[PDB]
Structure 1
Amino acid sequence: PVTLAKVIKVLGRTGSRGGVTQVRVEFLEDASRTIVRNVKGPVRENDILCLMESEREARRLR
């Protein structure tokens, strides 16, 4: 049940130590359900990173 989403914009850095980022993804299939999510790794625009689970939004990390 793993779903893939391509990123289309990076918002900025987040997390207490700045090691995570807020990035705007767009799903590979069904280009809808725009969800802001966080990435532990470095992010360029247009990353095809997949999702273990989708039903969760993201916020700033303490």
Structure 2
Amino acid sequence: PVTLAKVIKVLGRTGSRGGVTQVRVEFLEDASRTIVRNVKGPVRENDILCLMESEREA
């Protein structure tokens, strides 16, 4: 029960050391439920990183 989420906007660097980035994800199926979530590695727009749990903001 993994969920896939397309990124549409890189918000900005967060975290204490700036090593984690806020990004705005959009689900591939059911193109709604847009969420703000944090991601560790380097991110451009159009990265399909998958989410283990969806019902949580950041």
> Do both share a fold (TM > 0.5)?
yes
- Post-superposition offset of 1:41: 0.6
Give the C-alpha shift of residue 57 in structure 1: 0.5
**Deviation by residue 1:6-61 (Cα, 9 ceiling, x = unmatched):** 00010110000000000011111111001000001100001001001111100xxx
Unaligned stretches of 5+ residues in structure 1: none
TM-score normalised over the length of structure 1: 0.91
- How many positions carry a matched residue from both structures? 58
3-state SS of the aligned residue for 1:30?
coil
Using structure 2 for the length normalisation, give the TM-score. Answer: 0.97
More strand by share: 2
Gaps of 5+ in 2: none
CA distance in 2, matches of 1:42, 1:2: 21
- Percent identity over the alignment is 100
C-alpha RMSD of matched pairs (Å): 0.5
